[PDB]
Design a protein around this ligand. Structure first.
Ligand SMILES: [Cl-]
Lengths: 31, 31, 31
């Protein structure tokens, strides 16, 4: 069960990194 | 304790989905 | 191990709050 939680956290972190990169692109586009 | 962690992960995932939808709207607006 | 998971969740929540604030700024800028 702890491994399943950790795997889900991995997925969340990867998505968060992707979101930050999307935001960086939006800031560049309007910069 | 594991259930509390899992509930918090649920909240994080829901917010992440909301953020992705906000980003999609911003991209549409500037598209 | 549960504490390490909880600490990571703390980091994720803080980053999510930061992302929401970045999005609010972008919405204000294009508003
Ligand atoms: Cl996020």
């Amino acid at each position: 069960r702890m491994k399943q939680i950790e795997d889900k956290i991995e997925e969340i972190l990867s998505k968060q990194y992707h979101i930050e990169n999307e935001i960086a692109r939006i800031k560049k586009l309007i910069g």
